[PDB]
């Protein structure tokens, strides 16, 4: 009755725009270990993560392409979703590190999401018999200044409208959102339409980084219902099974302070960073909850956690991936991620006190 986290990373290769400027590499790897050495050569930070995807050079062994990321991270979530467990995956990286090529991909080189979804539908159409049935609903909502909004709804023919969606704690099924749409999906051609209808209504803005910078966390839920139980003295199911998958896109930890932000752009970096802090606290609590230490897991300080009390915790399986850049111009942007994902310390200098000895009659 344990859990896992399985933090990982992804070092992109140079873009041509950054490869013609002869930008200096600042990120090397030694198999599992990763390191970051400045161009000044006075300090060297070295980190260790459970997984390391090295996508710099096609010649290097241990090359972690898109399919490698799939088979290494996303398929166990698929398995536990079949085994009646809920799953939650996270994607992080500040703007320019290419989260999108890791999650979604390109129409010639896919990402995680569509591979995951097509393996889903193939496994369904394989196990689909007369006895068993599989039913899928989805949803795609966001978080913005700790307020909840739905991206899937078509906006009313109206002015600027902040939505009345608020949370509620059912005593048994757990937390949920009051009034959230739940549309049904059969083949991926539909889910792509729904996601692309969603993203356009997302909260974004321009900054010193780029015109395209997200400013609102995104949660994409897939609820999968298995119906196999059937009664022998009469047509009735003694029970069904429900699994909640939750793939999540995070905002970048803006340093509002160095961006000379002011106003509504300063009221976001204060909320974003708060949610990220609560998320880090929660995951560092879970990693200890796997080691038998009884502690508290503050799912309440942030909506992004409160909606996920059931998924992140219990007989479930979280997951993460973090995109970085190896350029020596995005160093402070990058190392933060490497220091934000320091949740792979599970056997690092634990003490010991045991008193039970030689129990007998």
């Amino acid at each position: 009755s344990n859990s896992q986290v399985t933090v990982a990373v992804r070092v992109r290769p140079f873009s041509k725009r950054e490869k013609t400027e002869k930008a200096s590499q600042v990120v090397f790897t030694n198999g599992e270990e990763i390191t970051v050495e400045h161009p000044d050569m006075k300090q060297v930070y070295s980190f260790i993560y459970d997984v390391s995807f090295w996508s710099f050079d096609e010649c290097h062994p241990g090359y972690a392409s898109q399919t490698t990321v799939y088979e290494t991270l996303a398929a166990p979530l698929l398995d536990r979703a079949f085994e009646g467990y809920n799953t939650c995956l996270f994607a992080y990286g500040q703007t320019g590190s290419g989260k999108s090529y890791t999650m979604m991909g390109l129409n010639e080189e896919p990402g995680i999401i569509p591979r995951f979804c097509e393996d889903l539908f193939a496994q369904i159409a394989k196990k689909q018999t007369s006895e068993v049935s599989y039913h899928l609903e989805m949803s795609f909502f966001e978080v913005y200044n700790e307020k909840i909004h739905d991206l899937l709804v078509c906006k009313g023919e109206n002015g600027q409208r902040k939505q009345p969606l608020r949370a509620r704690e059912h005593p048994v099924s757990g937390p949920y959102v009051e009034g959230l749409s739940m549309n049904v999906v059969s083949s991926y051609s539909d889910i792509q339409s729904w996601l692309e209808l969603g993203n356009k209504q997302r909260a974004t803005a321009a900054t010193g980084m780029n015109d395209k910078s997200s400013r609102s966390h995104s949660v994409f839920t897939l609820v999968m219902t298995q119906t196999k139980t059937e009664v022998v003295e009469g047509e009735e199911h003694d029970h069904r099974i429900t699994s909640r998958i939750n793939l999540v896109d995070l905002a970048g930890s803006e340093r509002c302070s160095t961006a000379h932000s002011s106003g509504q752009r300063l009221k976001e970096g204060v909320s974003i960073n708060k949610s990220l802090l609560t998320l880090g606290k929660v995951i560092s609590a879970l990693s200890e909850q796997a080691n038998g230490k009884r502690v508290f897991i503050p799912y309440r300080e942030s909506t992004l956690t409160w909606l996920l009390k059931e998924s992140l915790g219990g007989n479930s399986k979280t997951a993460m991936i973090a995109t970085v850049s190896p350029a020596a111009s995005n160093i402070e942007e990058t190392l933060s991620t490497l220091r934000y994902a320091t949740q792979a310390r599970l056997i690092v200098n634990i003490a010991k006190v045991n008193e039970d000895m030689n129990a007998k009659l």
Binding site: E254, R255, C256, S257, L277, G280
Partner: protein
């Protein structure tokens, strides 16, 4: 000319500066209303010197200082005390709200909209100065204003002015005592920037001055006014070479030259001769040798840091009053004979010396006494590593639980700007461990 600018930040800053400018106005025969009857009688002399007090035409005298707190209750006590008529009315009460004992406000969300006026006033004071310069920032760690505003001002003065001397005479936190609980985070975050943009930061520790006050002057129930006068005497001993005459003068550049070997080890300590009360002003010769022995005697250091557990890398000694240099030399050799005072192999020279013929002064309402001579020592030692690591541990106990962060992310500070500073102090804890190693072939 030979002129300085004195900046103060926070309640600690103003409460040091009030004593400092009291002392300065007392030394030059100045009254609180800027005027001089002393020059009106003498009819000559530069006594109200142009180094600190500028001069208008009506005989008045105007300080070369401002101070800001974002906390009006202090400055408005200057605008209603004995010294309301001296200063320029531009004491920056921008204190529509405090900086909440955090660094994020002082550095970015409540320092914005204030700093520009301070830069304008600093330019106005610099243009009045036709020569030497140097900023004396009197600020405080832990506190939010004295940290944030100091950082935001020093990173801008390293931009606009650059190649000048900048010296921070700040209050280190005590390891046991403290009047706060968010002290270490703010201290570390200040260090992260003031290791770069400053040139030499003299530190003090209020617990040390408490022990010095009860042990020597026989004062059981002090107040901060009894401490800030000792600190003003420290500063006066620093600046007598610039204001007044003497055999060997030490300009501000020499302090940052001779005591800062490497650019990152510029956090020295300071002390004085406060074994000197009025009743014990008698019963004691107060020579030069005795004081040079006392300045290295622990329990008289103004920072609780046992140096015998470490080493000295440089020292400067600034004497006031009647001193004959052969006594100074006998005293220095008496220390170099001793073995409980370790020096590094690469600084056998060791000491700088400065002498000034003017003795100290005696504030009415003072716990000290009248002396024909007095001393100020300024040393750079490795032992302050032990003074950093404590604040390096407290942090690491608390940040592991991520306490006290939500107030600081509430005002733009990232989660990851902490670890970027903690590792900087980890480096500075190494660059005090490699400097104290003896060379080998």
């Amino acid at each position: 000319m030979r002129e300085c600018i004195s900046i103060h930040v926070g309640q600690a800053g103003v409460q040091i500066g009030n004593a400092c400018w009291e002392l300065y106005c007392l030394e030059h025969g100045i009254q609180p209303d800027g005027q001089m009857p002393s020059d009106k009688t003498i009819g000559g002399g530069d006594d109200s010197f142009n180094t600190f007090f500028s001069e208008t035409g009506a005989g008045k005298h105007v300080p070369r200082a401002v101070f800001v707190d974002l906390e009006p209750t202090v400055i408005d006590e200057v605008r209603t005390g004995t010294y309301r008529q001296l200063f320029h009315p531009e004491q920056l009460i921008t204190g529509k709200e405090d900086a909440a004992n955090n660094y994020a406000r002082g550095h970015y969300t409540i320092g914005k909209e204030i700093i520009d006026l301070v830069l304008d006033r600093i330019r106005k004071l610099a243009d009045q100065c036709t020569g030497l310069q140097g900023f004396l920032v009197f600020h405080s760690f832990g506190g939010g204003t004295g940290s944030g505003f100091t950082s935001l001002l020093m990173e801008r003065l390293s931009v606009d002015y650059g190649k000048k001397s900048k010296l921070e005479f700040s209050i280190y936190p005590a390891p046991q005592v403290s009047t706060a609980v968010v002290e270490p985070y703010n201290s570390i975050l200040t260090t992260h920037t003031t290791l770069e943009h400053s040139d030499c930061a003299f530190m003090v520790d209020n617990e040390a001055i408490y022990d010095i006050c009860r042990r020597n002057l026989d004062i059981e129930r002090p107040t901060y006014t009894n401490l800030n006068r000792l600190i003003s005497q420290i500063v006066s001993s620093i600046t007598a070479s610039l204001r007044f005459d003497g055999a060997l003068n030490v300009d501000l550049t020499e302090f940052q030259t001779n005591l800062v070997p490497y650019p990152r080890i510029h956090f020295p300590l300071a002390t004085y001769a406060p074994v000197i009360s009025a009743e014990k002003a008698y019963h004691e010769q107060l020579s030069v040798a005795e004081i040079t022995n006392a300045c290295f005697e622990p329990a008289n250091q103004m920072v609780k840091c046992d140096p015998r557990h470490g080493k000295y890398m440089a020292c400067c000694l600034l004497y006031r009053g009647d001193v004959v240099p052969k006594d100074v030399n006998a005293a220095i050799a008496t220390i170099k004979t001793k073995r409980s005072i370790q020096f590094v192999d690469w600084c056998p020279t060791g000491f700088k010396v400065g002498i000034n013929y003017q003795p100290p002064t005696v504030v009415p309402g003072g716990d000290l006494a009248k002396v024909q001579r007095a001393v100020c020592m300024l040393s750079n030692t490795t032992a302050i590593a032990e003074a950093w690591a404590r604040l390096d541990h407290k942090f690491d106990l608390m940040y592991a639980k991520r306490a006290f962060v939500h107030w600081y992310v509430g005002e733009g500070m990232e989660e990851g700007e902490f670890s970027e500073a903690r590792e900087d102090m980890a480096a500075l804890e190494k660059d005090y461990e490699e400097v104290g190693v003896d060379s080998v072939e």
